[PDB]
Structures are given as structure tokens and as C-alpha cells.
Amino acid sequence: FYTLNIAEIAERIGNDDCAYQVLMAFINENGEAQMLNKTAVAEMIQLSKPTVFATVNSFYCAGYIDETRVGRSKIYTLSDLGVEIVECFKQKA
Amino acid sequence: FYTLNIAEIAERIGNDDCAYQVLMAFINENGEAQMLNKTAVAEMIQLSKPTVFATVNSFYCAGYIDETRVGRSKIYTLSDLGVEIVECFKQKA
DNA sequence: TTTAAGTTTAACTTTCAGTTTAAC
DNA sequence: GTTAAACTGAAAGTTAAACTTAAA
């Protein structure tokens, strides 16, 4: 339905500390994408649960992270869109 | 760069109270899209500033709302993408 | 004087595991 | 005698409000 420029998105995220760290949390010590529950993310970055959780929620809405039911809770991984956004940043650095 | 299905997004937002109300806040009494600062939104919906603000920020990242500098602060309006998402909901109702 | 936004703390609503007791 | 359920002991998460810092 709608075409998306991945460079603008990455540009926007880069200008917003919380979005940026929420995104990068899913990338591990060896550069590999990983699974995380909401609590892990909030613990990993130094921002409050409300901030981090709301960001996680919106990023799943945006389709940047995936949600999958696991136990009676949920886990988050970067979507293919998520991984592509992360790539723009890696190239900068 | 990336194609987007507007129905899935709307589906995701509809399953998340905060995202949904943050989005609809921009639609006024007469059905018209309107401008809002971050404070207006948080005051309008009954959720905490941290939740609402983080959601606003991520929605601008996603390209659902636009940011424009005004005074030395910012204001938010739905993008064309934002308006299209709102339309799916209007059709449901 | 009404200034706005963000962060932290407190309160309220919907925590998990182990042990003991009761019922089949 | 074994299994299941409930209660108690060692509760967690989210949202809202208030205060402080950067104030117009």
C-alpha cells in the first residue's frame, strides 16, 4: 500500500536517544540480532520502563520489531525492516 | 526502499490503547485533522506524559506524524500515512 | 504567576513457587 | 497413596501524580 524510505527513518531514529537505544538493544555483543522481553530492554538501556515499553510497543506497530507469544508472555526480535534500519547505522559507524 | 501494508499497521495500533488514542487525538470534533503540541496530546488522553511522549516520538520516527518547528518548540500533525491509517479505523466504525 | 516537560516514586490492580491438606 | 488445589511466604508491573529543573 505505501512505500517507505529507510534512510529517512534511520535519520529520524538517530535524532532520538530512546528510539535509537531501543533498536540497538536487539543487536548483541557479536553483531547478531537477538530476542528480548520488554523488561530486558528497559534494564539494558538507562531509561524508565514507561519510556522504553511505549517505544517497544510503537516499534512493533511500525513493524520494526516482531512480537511472538512465548510462555504467556511475549518476545521481541527485529523484523527484516528492523535489521535494514540497523544496517544504515552500522555503515555510518 | 520498503513497501508497507496499511491494514497490518492499523490492525497493530487497534490492539494497543495508547498508540490508538495518540493517533486519534489529532482528529478533532468535526473529523478534521489538527495540530497539537506534545503536552496537548498527553492532556487529551488519560495516560502519563512519559507514555504519551515516547509514543509521539516513535510515531514521528515511523513517519505517521509530522514535526514542525514553531516558536522554539515543535508541533505534530498526521502525515499522509497518518491520515490513511485513521481512514481504516473510520471505516470500521 | 501560570510554565512546561521529564523523571521518579508510590499506589493499585492483576506474582510465582512450594508445601500442606483434602479428596478420590 | 497420589494428585490437585489453595494458601502463604518470599510480588511485580504499569500508570498517574508531584516535584524539580531548564522557564516564559
Determine, yes or no, domain membership for A50: yes
Structural biology method used: X-ray
Which bases on strand D have an atom closer than 7 Å to a protein beta carbon?
A: 13-18, 24
C-alpha cell read off for A65: 520489531
B28 CA to D15 C1', in Å? 25
Determine, yes or no, domain membership for B26: yes
End-to-end alpha carbon distance in chain B: 33
The position carrying cell 507514555 is: B51
Residue B72 approaches strand C within 7 Å at CB: no
Determine, yes or no, domain membership for B19: yes
Determine, yes or no, domain membership for A1: no
Alpha-carbon gap, residue A14 to A56, rounded angstroms: 16
Alpha-carbon gap, residue A66 to A74, rounded angstroms: 10
Experimental structure resolution, Å: 7.0
Determine, yes or no, domain membership for A13: yes
C-alpha closest to that of B49 among A87, A26, A12, A48: A48
Alpha-carbon gap, residue B75 to B27, rounded angstroms: 15
For residue B22, the domain's CATH number is 1.10.10.10
Question: Chain B, 30-49: which CBs lie within 7 Å of strand C?
Answer: 37-39, 42, 48-49
Output helix, strand, coil percentages for chain A, rounded to the nearest 5.
Answer: 55, 20, 25
Phi, psi values for residue B32, rounded to 5° = -85, 140
A30 CA to D9 C1', in Å? 41
Say whether B75 sits in a helix, a strand or coil: strand
Are the C-beta atoms of residues B31 and B24 closer than 8 Å to each other?
no
How many domains would you assign to chain B? 1
Residue B73 approaches strand C within 7 Å at CB: yes
Mutate to test the interface with B, among A61, A78, A85 (most CBs of B within 10 A): A61
Determine, yes or no, domain membership for A70: yes
Give the CA angle between residues A44, A26, A89 to the nearest 5°. 110
Are the C-beta atoms of residues B49 and B43 closer than 8 Å to each other?
no
Full domain range(s) for residue A44: 6-92
C-alpha cell read off for B75: 508541533
A15 CA to C9 C1', in Å? 29
